[PDB]
Amino acid sequence: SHTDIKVPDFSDYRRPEVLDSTKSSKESSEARKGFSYLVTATTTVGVAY
Amino acid sequence: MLTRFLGPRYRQLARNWVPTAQLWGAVGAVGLVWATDWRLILDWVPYINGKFK
Amino acid sequence: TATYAQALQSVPETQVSQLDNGLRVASEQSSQPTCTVGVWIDAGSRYESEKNNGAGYFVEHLAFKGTKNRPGNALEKEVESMGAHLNAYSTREHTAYYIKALSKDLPKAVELLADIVQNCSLEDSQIEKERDVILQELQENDTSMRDVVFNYLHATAFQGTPLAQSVEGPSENVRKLSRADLTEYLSRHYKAPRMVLAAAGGLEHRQLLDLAQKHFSGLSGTYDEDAVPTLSPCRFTGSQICHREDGLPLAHVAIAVEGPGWAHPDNVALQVANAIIGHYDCTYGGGAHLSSPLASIAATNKLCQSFQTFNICYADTGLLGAHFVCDHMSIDDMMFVLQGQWMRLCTSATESEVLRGKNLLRNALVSHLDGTTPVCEDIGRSLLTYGRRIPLAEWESRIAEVDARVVREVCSKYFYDQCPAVAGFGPIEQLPDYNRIRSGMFWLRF
Amino acid sequence: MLSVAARSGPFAPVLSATSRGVAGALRPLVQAAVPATSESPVLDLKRSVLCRESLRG
Amino acid sequence: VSASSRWLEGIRKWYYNAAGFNKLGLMRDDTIHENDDVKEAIRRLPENLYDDRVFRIKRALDLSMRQQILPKEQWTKYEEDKSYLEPYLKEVIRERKEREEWAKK
Amino acid sequence: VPPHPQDLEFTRLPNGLVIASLENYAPASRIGLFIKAGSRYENSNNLGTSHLLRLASSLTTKGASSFKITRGIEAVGGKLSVTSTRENMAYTVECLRDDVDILMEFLLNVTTAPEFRRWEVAALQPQLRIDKAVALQNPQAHVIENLHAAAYRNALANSLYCPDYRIGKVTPVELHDYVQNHFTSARMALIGLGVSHPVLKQVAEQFLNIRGGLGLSGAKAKYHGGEIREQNGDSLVHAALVAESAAIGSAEANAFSVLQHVLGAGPHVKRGSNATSSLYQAVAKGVHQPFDVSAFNASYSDSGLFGFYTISQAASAGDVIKAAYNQVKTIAQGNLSNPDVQAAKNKLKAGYLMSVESSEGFLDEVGSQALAAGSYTPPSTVLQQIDAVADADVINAAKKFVSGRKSMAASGNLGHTPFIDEL
Amino acid sequence: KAVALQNPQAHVIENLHAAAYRNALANSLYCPDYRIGKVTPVELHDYVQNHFTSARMALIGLGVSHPVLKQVAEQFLNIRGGLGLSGAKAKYHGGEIREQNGDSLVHAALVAESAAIGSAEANAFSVLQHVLGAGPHVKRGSNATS
Amino acid sequence: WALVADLLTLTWIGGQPVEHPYITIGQLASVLYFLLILVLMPTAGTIENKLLKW
Amino acid sequence: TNIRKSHPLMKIVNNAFIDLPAPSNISSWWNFGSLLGICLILQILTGLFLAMHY
Amino acid sequence: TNIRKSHPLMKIVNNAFIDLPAPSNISSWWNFGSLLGICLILQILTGLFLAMHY
Ligand SMILES: CCCCCC[C@H]1C(=O)O[C@H](C)[C@H](NC(=O)c2cccc(NC=O)c2O)C(=O)O[C@@H](C)[C@@H]1OC(=O)C(C)C
Ligand SMILES: CCCCCC[C@H]1C(=O)O[C@H](C)[C@H](NC(=O)c2cccc(NC=O)c2O)C(=O)O[C@@H](C)[C@@H]1OC(=O)C(C)C
Numbered sequence A: 001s002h003t004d005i006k007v008p009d010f011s012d013y014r015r016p017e018v019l020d021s022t023k024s025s026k027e028s029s030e031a032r033k034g035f036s037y038l039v040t041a042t043t044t045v046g047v048a049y
Numbered sequence B: 001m002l003t004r005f006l007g008p009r010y011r012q013l014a015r016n017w018v019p020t021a022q023l024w025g026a027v028g029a030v031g032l033v034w035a036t037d038w039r040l041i042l043d044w045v046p047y048i049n050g051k052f053k
Numbered sequence C: 001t002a003t004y005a006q007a008l009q010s011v012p013e014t015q016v017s018q019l020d021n022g023l024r025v026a027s028e029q030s031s032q033p034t035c036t037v038g039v040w041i042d043a044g045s046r047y048e049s050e051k052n053n054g055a056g057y058f059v060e061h062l063a064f065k066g067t068k069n070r071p072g073n074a075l076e077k078e079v080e081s082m083g084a085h086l087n088a089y090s091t092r093e094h095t096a097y098y099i100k101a102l103s104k105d106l107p108k109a110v111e112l113l114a115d116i117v118q119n120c121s122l123e124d125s126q127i128e129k130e131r132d133v134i135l136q137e138l139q140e141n142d143t144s145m146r147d148v149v150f151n152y153l154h155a156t157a158f159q160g161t162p163l164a165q166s167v168e169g170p171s172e173n174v175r176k177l178s179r180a181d182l183t184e185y186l187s188r189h190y191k192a193p194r195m196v197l198a199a200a201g202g203l204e205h206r207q208l209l210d211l212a213q214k215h216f217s218g219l220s221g222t223y224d225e226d227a228v229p230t231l232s233p234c235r236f237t238g239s240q241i242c243h244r245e246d247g248l249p250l251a252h253v254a255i256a257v258e259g260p261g262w263a264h265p266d267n268v269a270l271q272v273a274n275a276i277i278g279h280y281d282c283t284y285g286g287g288a289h290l291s292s293p294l295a296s297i298a299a300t301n302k303l304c305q306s307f308q309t310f311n312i313c314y315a316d317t318g319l320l321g322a323h324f325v326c327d328h329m330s331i332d333d334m335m336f337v338l339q340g341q342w343m344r345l346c347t348s349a350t351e352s353e354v355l356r357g358k359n360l361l362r363n364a365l366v367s368h369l370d371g372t373t374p375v376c377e378d379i380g381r382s383l384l385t386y387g388r389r390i391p392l393a394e395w396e397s398r399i400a401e402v403d404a405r406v407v408r409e410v411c412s413k414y415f416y417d418q419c420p421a422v423a424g425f426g427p428i429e430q431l432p433d434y435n436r437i438r439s440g441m442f443w444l445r446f
Numbered sequence D: 001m002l003s004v005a006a007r008s009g010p011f012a013p014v015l016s017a018t019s020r021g022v023a024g025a026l027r028p029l030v031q032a033a034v035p036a037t038s039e040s041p042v043l044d045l046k047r048s049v050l051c052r053e054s055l056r057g
Numbered sequence E: 001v002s003a004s005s006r007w008l009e010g011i012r013k014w015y016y017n018a019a020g021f022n023k024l025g026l027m028r029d030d031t032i033h034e035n036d037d038v039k040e041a042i043r044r045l046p047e048n049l050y051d052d053r054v055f056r057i058k059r060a061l062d063l064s065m066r067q068q069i070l071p072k073e074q075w076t077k078y079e080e081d082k083s084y085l086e087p088y089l090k091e092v093i094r095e096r097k098e099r100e101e102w103a104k105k
Numbered sequence F: 001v002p003p004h005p006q007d008l009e010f011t012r013l014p015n016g017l018v019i020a021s022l023e024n025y026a027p028a029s030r031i032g033l034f035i036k037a038g039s040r041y042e043n044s045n046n047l048g049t050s051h052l053l054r055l056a057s058s059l060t061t062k063g064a065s066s067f068k069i070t071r072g073i074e075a076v077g078g079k080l081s082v083t084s085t086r087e088n089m090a091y092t093v094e095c096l097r098d099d100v101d102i103l104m105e106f107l108l109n110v111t112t113a114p115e116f117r118r119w120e121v122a123a124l125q126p127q128l129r130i131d132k133a134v135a136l137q138n139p140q141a142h143v144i145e146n147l148h149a150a151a152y153r154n155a156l157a158n159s160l161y162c163p164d165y166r167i168g169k170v171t172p173v174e175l176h177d178y179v180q181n182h183f184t185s186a187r188m189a190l191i192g193l194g195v196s197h198p199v200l201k202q203v204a205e206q207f208l209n210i211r212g213g214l215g216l217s218g219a220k221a222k223y224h225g226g227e228i229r230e231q232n233g234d235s236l237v238h239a240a241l242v243a244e245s246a247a248i249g250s251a252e253a254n255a256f257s258v259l260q261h262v263l264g265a266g267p268h269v270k271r272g273s274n275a276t277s278s279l280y281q282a283v284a285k286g287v288h289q290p291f292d293v294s295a296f297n298a299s300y301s302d303s304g305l306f307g308f309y310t311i312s313q314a315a316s317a318g319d320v321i322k323a324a325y326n327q328v329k330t331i332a333q334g335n336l337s338n339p340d341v342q343a344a345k346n347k348l349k350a351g352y353l354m355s356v357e358s359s360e361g362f363l364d365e366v367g368s369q370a371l372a373a374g375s376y377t378p379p380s381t382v383l384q385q386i387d388a389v390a391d392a393d394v395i396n397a398a399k400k401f402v403s404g405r406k407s408m409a410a411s412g413n414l415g416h417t418p419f420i421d422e423l
Numbered sequence G: 001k002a003v004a005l006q007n008p009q010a011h012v013i014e015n016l017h018a019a020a021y022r023n024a025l026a027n028s029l030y031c032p033d034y035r036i037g038k039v040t041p042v043e044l045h046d047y048v049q050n051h052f053t054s055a056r057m058a059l060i061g062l063g064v065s066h067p068v069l070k071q072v073a074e075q076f077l078n079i080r081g082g083l084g085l086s087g088a089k090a091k092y093h094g095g096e097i098r099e100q101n102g103d104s105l106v107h108a109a110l111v112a113e114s115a116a117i118g119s120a121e122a123n124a125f126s127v128l129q130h131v132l133g134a135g136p137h138v139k140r141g142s143n144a145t146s
Numbered sequence H: 001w002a003l004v005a006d007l008l009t010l011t012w013i014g015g016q017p018v019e020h021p022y023i024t025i026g027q028l029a030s031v032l033y034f035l036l037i038l039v040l041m042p043t044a045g046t047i048e049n050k051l052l053k054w
Numbered sequence I, J: 001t002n003i004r005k006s007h008p009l010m011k012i013v014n015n016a017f018i019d020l021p022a023p024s025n026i027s028s029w030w031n032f033g034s035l036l037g038i039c040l041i042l043q044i045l046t047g048l049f050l051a052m053h054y
Helices: A029-048 B008-016 B018-036 C004-010 C055-063 C074-081 C103-118 C124-141 C145-157 C171-176 C179-189 C205-215 C266-277 C293-300 C331-348 C351-368 C372-385 C392-401 C404-415 C434-439 E005-019 E036-044 E047-066 E086-102 F049-054 F066-075 F097-112 F118-122 F125-135 F139-151 F172-182 F197-207 F251-263 F278-286 F314-332 F338-355 F359-373 F379-387 F391-403 G008-020 G041-051 G066-076 G120-132 H002-014 H020-052 I008-017 I032-051 J008-017 J032-051
Strands: C015-018 C024-029 C034-041 C085-090 C095-102 C195-201 C240-244 C251-259 C279-281 C306-311 C318-326 C421-426 D013-016 F009-012 F018-022 F028-035 F079-084 F089-096 F188-193 F226-231 F236-244 F291-300 F303-313 F406-412
Touching: B008 B018, B008 C331, B008 C351, C004 C392, C004 F097, C015 C205, C024 C205, C024 C372, C034 C103, C034 C372, C034 F338, C055 C085, C055 C095, C055 C124, C055 C179, C074 C085, C074 C103, C074 F338, C095 C103, C095 C372, C095 F338, C103 C195, C103 C205, C124 C171, C124 C179, C145 C240, C145 C251, C145 C318, C145 C421, C195 C205, C195 C372, C251 C331, C251 C404, C266 C306, C266 C318, C266 C331, C266 C351, C266 C392, C266 C404, C279 C293, C293 C306, C293 C331, C318 C331, C331 C404, C351 C392, C351 C404, C351 F028, C351 F066, C351 F089, D013 F049, D013 F125, E005 H020, E036 E086, E036 F118, E086 F066, F009 F197, F018 F197, F018 F359, F028 F097, F028 F359, F049 F079, F049 F089, F049 F125, F049 F172, F066 F079, F066 F097, F079 F097, F089 F097, F089 F359, F097 F197, F118 F172, F139 F226, F139 F236, F139 F303, F139 F406, F188 F197, F188 F359, F236 F314, F236 F391, F251 F278, F251 F291, F251 F303, F251 F314, F251 F338, F251 F379, F251 F391, F278 F291, F278 F314, F291 F314, F303 F314, F303 F391, F314 F391, F314 F406, F338 F379, F338 F391, H002 H020
Parallel strands: C024 C195, C240 C421, F018 F188, F226 F406
Antiparallel strands: C015 C024, C034 C095, C034 C195, C085 C095, C251 C318, C251 C421, C279 C306, C306 C318, D013 F079, F009 F018, F028 F089, F028 F188, F079 F089, F236 F303, F236 F406, F291 F303
């Protein structure tokens, strides 16, 4: 009965490199983290100034 | 009597954190430099010469 | 004095043979008077689909219920009277049916396996009876918090993929599967090139081959047109499922990171690091003095009741992590400590702890391969996964290769700054937020 | 065929340093998880089974 | 046994009397600084020792507050000073050192 | 083709010690010191002492501190285990070939040089509670413990777990006294796999020579009979009904062993009807819903308990028990076919064969044989002994269960569980 | 229960009754631990309503009047719907219960079935008890006549 | 007490002009200060241990 | 053990803005508490630099 | 219930100088902690009155 518990679909929120159920997410692992960290790196570079 | 930390493992622990401790001094030097606009050191960096002709 | 190295040399080579079916036939002879034979099928539930899920499981329940030449009792009665043991199991990737038996009973042992694997009756009246037993098995399984949380880990980590499914299926499938659903999964999956007749004990490989060719000939006398049972890789998802229930006395948590999968050489090193962290239980003697820092801290400060690291493998992917059980006010500490250890290893594995890990693993291996059954299962399963049988010696060489650097490099590759799949169940109010758990997967010092 | 414990039946506790505390003598139960409704806890005020100090590569 | 060994003993008996804790009824070991090792050994004492140590220290803290001392005939006579905590302290230190030593390899 | 299958070497030292080994050629070694020190040797003033003892296998010894035992052993990935039954304790140690030297020492230290430091044993007492809680989580554990307390006036009635009233109350001297009067040469046996006889023998002669305990069956179990019932609201009623049988080693003990496989003792097929199980089939006839049954057979150095154990819904307890009983009664009356006994013998034989298949189970058999019979009896001859059981022997066995004073333990909602006189 | 069970007699006599009777009188005057927290409001309601009925009740009073009692009784104590008989009838069985414990002294009671209150034989028993002895009559005496 | 008095010394010198006696004595008091706290008190401690048999 | 929880000082800081449980629910109208704080310090901070010249 | 113990504010005050357990033993050398406190406030207090005129 706890085997009726499927995780609700998220395609509606997923980053595009991650939409495919047949694609390993390790490929976009670097790219995805890179981006968000670049975002904060720049940010902090901005506060720094 | 800091002899408790003298052994093979400590030697390996010490070595593992060598790159970190190094890069962490690179961060501080550049950091001190950039913050005080170190006239001495900076002159050497190619660009960043806001005191030339 | 016969050395350990030398001892590994003495273990007899596993003999492998292929029929014309493509059915691989393998054995490891020993002096034993008993043995273990059975067939390992490359069939699970990762092979199933939304609608026939639980089919393999439903078949297992039927596998011993009667064949054409041996209806109902018959089987049981043959096995029981010859004093043998008939057993089976199925995971997300494999299915097995093995018989423990007096080694002089190898001929009928095999005969019975064939019949079971080939002529499974599936009498309709049985399918109905079994429908209600499996339903019950589900109410039962619902009470093993551990079984639950591991299904949830799988459900969330591999969300949207077949691997996300459970072996038994959802209730409706059990309620809805039909004989036609079953037989079609059978014929779809029980094909020679995906079966492995395995055995260990007092047999001679030739005798096994003879039998295999006598009772198994004619399974793939029909190599299928365009039925291409190929496993699509399965996406992993850094995600989290929390089944809060303050009515349970203790919480189970299972955290994992994406593993490489059966064939990747990285396993050996990961297993070493896992051994370093190990496992714990409140009935272990020796608390404060344990080598595992996690274990010792858990024991002295009563951080839990039990924990255990693990490395699940499937084709090209796997869950790698730990699972623990504890009081409602300790979930935070356990996590901290667990994670701090993972990082310590990524960035600071010292040399000796790695030796211990390697030795543990050697002990584990050798100890695990003790007796007909455990061996037989390793043969059959390995043929499925590695294509061959990896001789003890080879594992010993793989382990020896590993040292601190390999651990740090290999651990960092899989754990460092990676996205976890968290599964929670029980009084989990203090289970840290996913962001927080995520942040614990890297160190600001490093 | 001595070895009371293994001759099945009488109880036998095992304690350990690295492994787990066991109580594993003989009586029924396996033939009770089949005709089902034998719950069992999921790590209630407890420990852990199957245990560890076995593995691979 | 020397004429001069009695001298060292004499310098020691001298310091003891000077150190003064005996006037407060204390024993040498009742005055050790409490640290982890010392705390663990305090833990290992059998009931009677522990109870006696508590009573002693209570008696001193009490004296110390009134700024008095015990009548001379009740001071702790050096040589009747039982080293009741040394064996435990010594054992606690040994095991720590074994640990410390294991942590190096 | 595997190597030359070595023969097991067995040796009785004059002082009573037994040494037995098998050169395995296996990558790992396994060594056990088995001792006549189980709970049956406790008494009314020191109950639980062997339980606490069972759990002190890593407190500090003279040649090795707690910390060292733990670290030392895990540094090579070895294990140290202690197993108890009502008659023996068995310290078992395991590791790879090259490491027996380290493990042996640790093993000798624990078994012959425990210090039982006052504070270390204070810190341990609480385990008695945890340990028991974990065991007592299976209804069988409590049933069988009650079964033994009802069946025996004195020795075998002792519990394998410490009575709650003793928790925190067993003292270092009781431990010291217990080791020194039961862990002596004449009651010990040293077994080894992946080890050599000379090494064992040297170790034995150098370290295992002590005497000063006792020597006899220190009491001799007095079978009494009686019954213990514990109402509890478990969901199902567990119950065991038993009668005195035969001591391990006698021919009658094998009759009983065969009897157990005629009636039924655990399943051979995953999720099967237990077709060939005659007890199961006999209950099923008259009883609906969930239930289980098996013949129960427990034999000791100077006694034995035989019968069956049933698990059923509270309301069907009586029905389950009576059918079970009648079944046995039916085979004591004469209704047993030769092909039936023949099939049992097969299960037993194949069973024993299987039980000593792995090394942990072989070590244990050799060890228990050493202590029970002071000798080693190869498989070929245990098989031969099983064949010697005649059909009549199995029947008499049954006759002996049926007409003998009974012992019963049951726990659950007992509203319909019958008392002994109502059977 | 803790407070009651602090006297060794309480536990002895409770065991005595559980060994002596198959069923009714074997019940305990204190709740079995396994039921603690488990007895429910309906069990209480059910218990009152099937045992607290007219035919099983009696109203006694001192410093009160019969008319008042009778009025109260007729106005408030009229209910029926429970049961009426000896709802079971004690089945004397016999047997023994022993509880090892490290109390300092051994308490023990040995008993056999006798006579129901009200019969002449019950007074024989009552007299028997005073022949054998039943509590002291003099502070700190040798129990001369016991 | 030697430390206290010596600090009372430094206080006194500090209060005087940088001339004849005053220089060399305040120079000695300084060395004393650092030598007392850095070498003397720590050694006094160890000797006391040894005297007590600690 | 996590020093971020048992150290007399951090406790306070853990309780202030690290582990303190807050509504998953608050909105922008709850920011003015930090803003008032910020205001208070910035005010104290420029205010002080003016006092070195005022 | 005694409000002197459960009120967020008093707690602090109870812990500071009411219920805090102290050695039956301390002597005058332990007074300088209050004196320093007193000093600090009195200093702050006269200091302020001078600032209204300085
Ligand atoms: C020095 C900086 C370290 C911070 C410690 C002091 C500061 C402090 O205590 O920090 C936390 C952050 C404190 N609460 C919040 O901010 C806060 C609380 C609920 C919700 C929100 N926001 C959005 O829902 C919040 O922002 C808060 O913001 O109070 C400040 C007034 C206080 O500042 C003060 O005391 C002054 C007296 C210093
Ligand atoms: C406003 C007055 C209420 C008092 C609360 C603040 C004051 C405070 O905390 O009070 C208690 C009294 C605190 N401790 C002691 O006095 C004290 C402690 C052990 C022994 C003695 N004496 C003799 O053995 C003591 O006197 C102490 O004396 O500290 C002061 C520095 C602090 O003062 C301060 O913080 C300033 C920062 C205000």
